[PDB]
Design a protein around this ligand. Structure first.
Ligand SMILES: C/C(=N\OCCN)c1cccc(C(C)(C)NC(=O)Nc2ccc(Cl)c([N+](=O)[O-])c2)c1
Ligand SMILES: C/C(=N\OCCN)c1cccc(C(C)(C)NC(=O)Nc2ccc(Cl)c([N+](=O)[O-])c2)c1
Ligand SMILES: C/C(=N\OCCN)c1cccc(C(C)(C)NC(=O)Nc2ccc(Cl)c([N+](=O)[O-])c2)c1
Ligand SMILES: C/C(=N\OCCN)c1cccc(C(C)(C)NC(=O)Nc2ccc(Cl)c([N+](=O)[O-])c2)c1
Ligand SMILES: O=c1[nH]cnc2c1ncn2[C@@H]1O[C@H](COP(=O)(O)O)[C@@H](O)[C@H]1O
Ligand SMILES: O=c1[nH]cnc2c1ncn2[C@@H]1O[C@H](COP(=O)(O)O)[C@@H](O)[C@H]1O
Ligand SMILES: O=c1[nH]cnc2c1ncn2[C@@H]1O[C@H](COP(=O)(O)O)[C@@H](O)[C@H]1O
Ligand SMILES: O=c1[nH]cnc2c1ncn2[C@@H]1O[C@H](COP(=O)(O)O)[C@@H](O)[C@H]1O
Lengths: 327, 327, 326, 327
């Protein structure tokens, strides 16, 4: 009854994947995927380009486990290049790096330093400035470019037309995100993946599902509705390999975790669109990633899918509504 | 299922605005709007006509920042006139003043005092007494009259036909409102703005979205579905410029904030339709208004809208369902 | 809706809001006169519940004086119930009701002889053989208006009316102290239940009593708006001084006992009500004043000068379900 | 709005049963039911095959009250056989026993020991391994086999065609279940029973509703939408007859209750799909079961159903939205 009402948006919590006939065990499924149309991964996990999540140590950790880390850009170009070189000089290991609009010089140095992918990011990926930066990169240098963040078919189509090698989806869903309350803007993440994958898959362009992952189950849901990989922040921020500081709040140890659109991140008249928060310290990332990969394998076993491509073809979900004390 | 069921009603929390292709930056958008058909504002913010929110200092503050304040009527005619004169005597600043049903004498004195707009208020705007008062004002004096509060198409049409220069929308959504629980009456504010805007827009008559604003994001939502401006109470009640008293509750400083239909406000056999509450002290209104305006600019940027006219044209929304500890 | 046994969405009071109409009537001007049964009228549409923590003679005298009516509960010997009814009648000839259960023909007889104005035939499941038999037997042996409940369906409403019901009490599920939903898994949301039952009863001119679930004055307006002629109230009145419930100090607050008639204590088993406590509210007149005031406000918003007009003009909208009150 | 969306899933809390005309009292209803196509029970209650719920003492209690207990498999074959023999030597009492995939030797020993039903269970019942194990059992020995857990029509149909004598439904609903959050997989239990019973009732094959029972009212709901019986874990875990350990926490006594997919159960590199929890100690199981049976009787009385078969015929439900302090 609303003219401007385009429908009901679903987030991860709104749905559950329905089991299929299965002939494959969790241990047997292949988790190989495409990061961009020219770069592959062994597992579909990416660490977020945030200054409390990913520098060289996190990037090295991610790559060793078959994923990839995106070096954040909240540092001068020289330091970012050096972080990339740190990962690259640690054996033949893939690594990514973030840039912002009009940062062509930063992009050039990164590419020279041997980065495998450039992540061109903005709060609003479907914009004139972003597209102009994209076209400039593709014409000046030889590199795969992931562009984001977008949530619509139209955005996805236009970015692909201008040379996007990967599409990053997510406005609204981040754990430290306040765009939804500051600007009133967003799209629930399942719906956003569905819309963007509906265009991108037609062109063989990978969708990165960015933000809102809380449990391993969410990874399965994101991939099932069309994503090729997921980008993760808060979960990895609590690990020993994250660059964030530590603080003892009362009894337990916490790691700092802040949005790149927070007051503190922007200092490194403002209208912040992210908070500065704390997450519980969780130790080594390897144990953390193992559980995440373990959960996804279990999911794909339930859906009888031996690969992500198969999962796209076989998956379906149900909408759900939203006395034992756990030890 | 019920014949009397007119459908599902949405409030601000129920929806999220969808991003469009954008070639305008937040800093570049124009927030100019019409308060009434003959009075314009530089920003679409109005402070509520309540005795804990708007007297002359709040009204001056709002006017200086491009908005307007409505002097409340919980005082003798002479006192209300003097408050208006205080705003008027400090630069050529705009100001409004509230009156109730049959208060023709008060309105006359306010108009003579140079008030820019009269706000004819009632719990139930769509009524015989309100219409009569409106017609009497329009025939005895020359001034723009805003009439409210209403939530239906029929109400909006009738008030416009009888000469209303602006329509104030909102029954149910105010933070201190108990009409919904005392009378069981109301309409969720997004739905109410849509219904009323569907009639008023072709007439070129501005809709004021009154009540329920908690975050800057809500302002964007209100304007996007048809409103020309928003009226705000509780957010401004906490500022140093509001007339409410201060109380120290344990650790933090609070300001009094009460509905004009509360027992205490009606004392200044009763059946109250508002509560007497407290809100945290927030300091200078300038910083508060800065954030609100900033959030709206962010919104219009996401929606590629360089003006409010453009926002009405381009906006769409999605209906939504309703680990990190903030520092 | 995907399930073959799914008959649709059920709405309770909290699920909806009444939409304002054009109004030419003030809250003070509306008439609250209504029918209790097709032969008994009331000045206000409020009934106090037939529970042993809510209504004995003092509550029933309170209700009647204010324009409503009280239903004396049946958790007492027959002679005792008659004496309560006689206490109400001895003071101004005020109207009063009384509850009976299935097969309690002797009790109904004594009550009618005592001058009761209406008999309330009550069961957990009103649409049953035993209830129908008792109803038919009453109508044939004595001359009295009989309210029957509780029911939630069109077919229940129709059959009870065809067997002589003078009023229909609607409510399975909504009571504040009710656990039928949890114990039996049974019930219908109260807005939907009133709509279904009134759709049948309005054709025969038989009043609907909306029983249970009232928390705020606004709920009264909603119930009447969708077809009810009156509402029955328990927990709100249970905290008043006129209620027969005991009082207990818990912490720094005085509480009144309030228990379901299907609770262990009331029956003294598979209980379908809880034993609870409600905050003490003082005299009932002030409480009833607020309730009536809120309903007047509602009828003013909906431009309805009477309950009849409210039935004709009312519509509602479905809704989704940092100012700190002093 | 989503193509892979198969609809809204309902759990127990989402519905309420609608009363029918009744000519039967709660005390008059028959609770007799089929456990499998060749085994009948006096009441439709089964205790879960978990090591904190059912060993011989629980199984004897369930049998004497008219139901049945399923001896868990987290013990050696000889120990499980010994538990079965303990129940059989306590008079002619029904008893069941659980096996996993490929546990043909275990099944043979249990059958030779006089077990009345084999419960072939897996996290994902609709799989190649489960089907092969089923066909192997049916071909090598003579016993009724209950197979689970499944949530779909296709799964139900295939297991039945391959010789299942009972179908256990439930992926998602258990009180200690985290398959939902670890794998992102599940189906709300009312919907799951509906889908599976739509197939199984055509073949006269009983549906067991497994998991998520919290109140007696839930049993009525499960049977009403097509189940022949319900399996219960958490409710019975707190009884004196459960094998769980006891522990004082504060001033209240708790019993241990853990998923069989918990790390604690699998110890008796893990990716658990159940939690380790505690439930309040509730004394003898007899009083507990009495309330559940009484609740179901009350339900069938409301629905005018003198038997479960009649309940299937007459039942309907409504979908619902989801100041008195209890003593
Ligand atoms: C929200 C955000 N990042 O989010 C990542 C995707 N969820 C973020 C990161 C750093 C700074 C900021 C800040 C600077 C706080 N805010 C924005 O940039 N907001 C914004 C609003 C509308 C538009 Cl159209 C544009 N734009 O680039 O043209 C930007 C935000
Ligand atoms: C609720 C309210 N204001 O709300 C502002 C808009 N949300 C308010 C303010 C002062 C006094 C009151 C009081 C006096 C407490 N309440 C009403 O006036 N209620 C009301 C109900 C229905 C009608 Cl039909 C009429 N009417 O005069 O025609 C009035 C309420
Ligand atoms: C639930 C209830 N009253 O509710 C009033 C309306 N909500 C109540 C009052 C006293 C005792 C009880 C008790 C005795 C606790 N429970 C029932 O009577 N339950 C019940 C269930 C199904 C049927 Cl079919 C019948 N029946 O008489 O035919 C009765 C309940
Ligand atoms: C979840 C569960 N039981 O649930 C009972 C019914 N809800 C459970 C019990 C013991 C171990 C486990 C463990 C071992 C923790 N997890 C699984 O077995 N998970 C799983 C995932 C997908 C598949 Cl395709 C299969 N499989 O049948 O090969 C198994 C889980
Ligand atoms: O300040 C911000 N505001 C909104 N989103 C942000 C901000 N900073 C980072 N993000 C996004 O949030 C994601 C992480 O989401 P999380 O894993 O749910 O913590 C990142 O990959 C970014 O896309
Ligand atoms: O007592 C009352 N009851 C209901 N609404 C009120 C009352 N007093 C003021 N209002 C409305 O509530 C608005 C403020 O809502 P808020 O900004 O959400 O606090 C005012 O502009 C009035 O329209
Ligand atoms: O024990 C019980 N179980 C269920 N309903 C009850 C029980 N006792 C009283 N009731 C109902 O609950 C109504 C009161 O509801 P309340 O006003 O919401 O407290 C009564 O008028 C009865 O219809
Ligand atoms: O570890 C587990 N993960 C998920 N489900 C489990 C696990 N262990 C047992 N279950 C299921 O949960 C049921 C008990 O559900 P409850 O009665 O709601 O506690 C059992 O009968 C099993 O079907």
């Amino acid at each position: 009854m609303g003219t401007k009402n385009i429908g009901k948006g679903l987030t991860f919590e709104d749905i559950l994947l329905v089991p299929n006939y299965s002939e494959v065990l969790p241990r047997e499924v292949s988790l190989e995927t495409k990061l961009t149309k020219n770069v592959s991964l062994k597992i579909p996990l990416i660490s977020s380009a945030m200054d409390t999540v990913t520098e060289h140590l996190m990037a090295v950790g991610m790559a060793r486990l078959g994923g990839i880390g995106i070096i954040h850009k909240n540092m001068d170009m020289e330091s970012q290049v050096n972080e990339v070189l740190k990962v690259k000089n640690s054996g033949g290991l893939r690594v990514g790096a973030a840039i912002g609009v009009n940062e062509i010089e930063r992009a050039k140095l990164l590419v020279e330093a041997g980065v495998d992918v450039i992540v061109l990011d903005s709060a609003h990926g479907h914009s004139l400035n972003i597209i102009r930066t994209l076209k400039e990169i593709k014409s000046k240098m030889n590199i795969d470019v992931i562009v984001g963040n977008v949530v619509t078919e139209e955005a996805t189509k236009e970015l692909i037309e201008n040379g996007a090698d990967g599409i990053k989806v997510g406005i609204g869903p981040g754990s430290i995100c306040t765009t939804r309350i500051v600007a009133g803007v967003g799209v629930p993440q399942i719906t956003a993946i569905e819309k963007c994958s509906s265009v991108a898959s037609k062109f063989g362009i990978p969708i990165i599902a960015d933000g809102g992952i809380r449990y391993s189950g969410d990874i399965g849901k994101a991939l099932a509705v069309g994503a090729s990989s997921v980008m993760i922040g808060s979960i990895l921020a609590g690990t020993e390999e994250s660059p964030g500081e530590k603080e003892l709040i009362g009894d337990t140890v916490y790691k700092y975790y802040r949005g790149m659109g927070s007051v503190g991140a922007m200092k490194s008249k403002m209208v912040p669109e992210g908070i500065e928060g704390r997450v519980k310290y969780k130790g080594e990332m390897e144990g953390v990633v193992y559980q995440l990969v373990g959960g996804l394998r279990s999911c794909m076993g339930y859906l009888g899918s031996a690969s992500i491509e198969e999962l796209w073809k076989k998956s379906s979900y149900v909408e759900i509504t939203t006395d034992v004390e756990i030890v």
